[PDB]
């Protein structure tokens, strides 16, 4: 759209305070997910591999888990090779702020804090790569 991404503050799995507006200057691949979401099992390892490249190119991932316990979320991260920030939307406030319907949904947010594209359903590693390029600082 080019619309303003709603700001939010959540904690990551180790207690790190992450506020979306502090990531201006970086692309944010904002991925709403749950451990029961089948596509996330294949998308997570693609995202981890791509992050190896993109983290130093100024694209951040914030993988917003929707409402699940730390133990289940940590277990999923171990299972699927997660090396990127995962935050806990424990009471669905951020999911609701983004008006998210199906999971997974990814918002591609550019370095200015604007939503440039919203994607739902399945995506391959090539698509993820291309998506991250859309939001990297120029």
**d(C-alpha 45, C-alpha 40), whole Å:** 9
Burial of 12: CB neighbours in 10 Å, binned 0-12, 13-18, 19+: middle
Contact 2, 116 (CB under 8 A): yes
**d(C-alpha 131, C-alpha 107), whole Å:** 10
In the chain, how many H helices and how many E strands? 4, 8
**d(C-alpha 100, C-alpha 70), whole Å:** 21
CATH fold group of domain 1-138? Glutaredoxin (3.40.30)
Burial of 138: CB neighbours in 10 Å, binned 0-12, 13-18, 19+: exposed
Experimental method: X-ray
Q: Following DSSP, what letter does each residue of 71-121 receive, concatenated?
A: HHHHHHHHHTT--S-EEEETTSHHHHHTT--SSSEEEEE-TTSEEEEEEES
Strand, helix or coil at 52? Answer: helix
């Amino acid at each position: 759209e080019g619309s303003d991404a709603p700001n939010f503050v959540l904690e990551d799995t180790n207690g790190k305070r992450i506020e979306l507006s502090d990531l201006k200057g970086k692309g944010v691949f904002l991925n709403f997910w749950g451990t029961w979401c089948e596509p996330c099992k294949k998308q997570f390892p693609y995202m981890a591999n791509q992050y190896k490249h993109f983290k130093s190119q100024g694209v951040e991932i914030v993988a917003v888990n929707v409402g699940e316990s730390k133990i289940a979320v940590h277990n999923f991260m171990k299972s699927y090779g997660v090396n990127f920030p995962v935050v806990l939307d424990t009471d669905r406030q951020v999911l609701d702020a983004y008006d998210v319907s199906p999971l997974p949904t990814t918002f591609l947010i550019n370095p200015e804090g604007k939503v440039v594209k919203v994607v739902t359903g399945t995506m391959t590693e090539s698509m993820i790569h291309d998506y991250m390029n859309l939001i990297k600082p120029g």
